[PDB]
């Protein structure tokens, strides 16, 4: 199928359910795609997934949807080259995409089980911006019978704080949302800092909504822990040094352009918390390499 | 700053969650039993134990050689399966 | 003159010249209350003018309206005042305090001479929120042949950085306005860090609007200078230690949405007031000096 139809499925899978990501609706697409060949020979059918993955990638700037793409492209071909007909191995591949869709639906509830453990009772939890994974992390926080409170930021220039913080009301918890410049301000009663991410790169550190970077200096001078959730298939291959070595088709959505996203150094992370387990910034460069198979 | 220690003092742990982390004795040892009525409304903490971060060591000396504190990881992905770190 | 009178001469002082701060409408309107006070005593005076300045510094809040009501008490009052006649010593304290308002008018154009050597040539400089005193440091360096770039933050709520900017735009420089929570991420083009003031402490700290603590923070980890432009009758009487022991008069104006906020002497480089250029630990004795 040509491009239209691409385009029309992946708007048209976002549409239909808002509680998924873009990742998600990628790989589905690029499933659907894999379903609709005709082809004969291997390399044609590689080519052709590479300039869909390519399309795909022009109409959302995101980190998560290339490195997807890429894990799909080299996870769907472990053993696929053995017999002499195309349609046993088109068939092993669409079963090796369906166990890998399948598998990716599992991260959410083991981040949480893994994560609520460390909230104490009685607590201050300071957040950044709108994620739906620190939702579900206080959801299965507070199913344990626990009591804290929470603080928010406006998270300027959409105003996603408030989604969060409405979302946060109708679970009768503690919410209150201060301004974007008060951060050090509030810092004091603060007791621990919990984030998104939108990919992990190389070195440890991480890129995520403008912002992130002046919390984490200010709790790195008071001395407070920072932890962070992501997840499998948001792990890039990149070693930036400073802000501007980002990519620039990241920063700019498609000074005063307002950058997007910025980027954190490993330095300034306590601990990371992955459906692989809980890794010290240390370990990440050993857990991708072995990712990328 | 130097630790010598063998290889059994490894364990499947994160410090997550502190309470019985410490161990508390009886405040016998601090202050005497013959103070009086003073042992009345005075709160008396006894713990034994405490923890240091990894920032502050420097090298780990075992029963194989020398190693960086970040290479204990490694370590224990190759003692304990993942499955039993939870009894 | 009554207590409404008092207000409608305050705002109505205020409102004539914008170009004019708080702490010199309520020198003027404390002026005019004495040359309007009857009675034979100088107890009932002191009892009525401690009296105006309660009600003025009621009206506004502000840090620099209460330190130059103490300044003017003591000053006017530093004198011999003995003599017989009530008359006499109440020309000798108008003509005390006519030479005070002359004296506090000329500060500005000597902070700006002091100050305006420190800027190289082609320097890019990062400033928060609005203040007359550092555009006048700019326009007079600008007027000494030399070229830099600044930057400014939109400063919310009120978003005062677009009027600075706007300022800035008649002086042909090259200005750009950035987010308020892209500070650490404009640090590394930066050279160094010019703010305003709105009350000096004991310790040497400063109180200024929200959102300056981040930025000396941002500016420490990074080892960039910062410079501080203050003056002198707003030198206040204050050991804050942490943020909380600041007073609740001045935090919350006339969700939590405080005004101000106070930034330690550790994080502060160089001080440019009108009693020169002095280092942090040089205001801690300067201040005792001052209020004889």
């Known amino acids: 199928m040509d491009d239209k139809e691409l385009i029309e499925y992946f708007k048209s899978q976002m549409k239909e359910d808002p509680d998924m990501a873009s990742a998600v609706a990628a790989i589905r697409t690029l499933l659907e795609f894999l379903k609709r060949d005709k082809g004969e020979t291997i390399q044609g059918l590689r080519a052709n997934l590479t300039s869909a993955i390519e399309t795909l990638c022009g109409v959302d700037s995101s980190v998560a949807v290339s490195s997807g793409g890429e894990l799909f492209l080299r996870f769907i071909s472990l053993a696929s080259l053995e017999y002499s007909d195309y349609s046993k191995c088109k068939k092993i591949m669409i079963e090796r995409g369906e166990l890998f869709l399948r598998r990716i639906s599992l991260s959410r509830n083991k981040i949480a089980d893994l994560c609520h453990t460390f909230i104490k009772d009685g607590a201050t939890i300071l957040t950044h911006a709108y994620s739906r994974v620190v939702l579900r992390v206080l959801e299965a926080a507070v199913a344990a019978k626990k009591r804290f409170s929470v603080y928010v930021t406006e998270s300027q220039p959409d105003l996603s704080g408030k989604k969060m913080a409405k979302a946060l009301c109708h679970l009768n918890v503690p919410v209150t949302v201060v301004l974007d410049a008060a951060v050090g301000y509030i810092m004091e009663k603060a007791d621990l800092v919990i984030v998104g991410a939108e990919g992990v790169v190389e070195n440890g550190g991480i890129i995520n909504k403008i912002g992130t970077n002046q919390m984490a200096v200010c709790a790195k001078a008071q001395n407070k822990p920072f932890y962070v959730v992501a997840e499998s298939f948001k792990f890039v291959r990149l070693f930036p040094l400073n802000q501007q070595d980002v990519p620039d088709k990241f920063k700019y959505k498609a000074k005063e352009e307002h950058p997007w996203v910025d980027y954190t150094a490993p330095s300034l992370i306590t601990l990371l918390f992955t459906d692989l387990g809980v890794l010290t910034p240390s370990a990440v460069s050993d857990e991708l390499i072995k990712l990328y198979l | ?87």
Do not use: W
């Open chain 2, 1 to 87: 700053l130097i630790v010598c220690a063998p290889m059994f003092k490894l364990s499947p742990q994160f410090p997550n969650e502190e309470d019985s982390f410490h161990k508390f004795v009886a405040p016998e040892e601090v202050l005497p039993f013959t103070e009086g009525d003073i042992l009345e409304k005075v709160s008396v903490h006894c713990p034994v134990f405490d923890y240091v971060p990894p920032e502050l060591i420097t090298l780990f000396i075992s029963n194989i050689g020398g190693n960086a504190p970040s290479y204990i990881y490694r370590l224990m992905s190759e003692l304990y399966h993942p499955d039993d770190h939870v009894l």
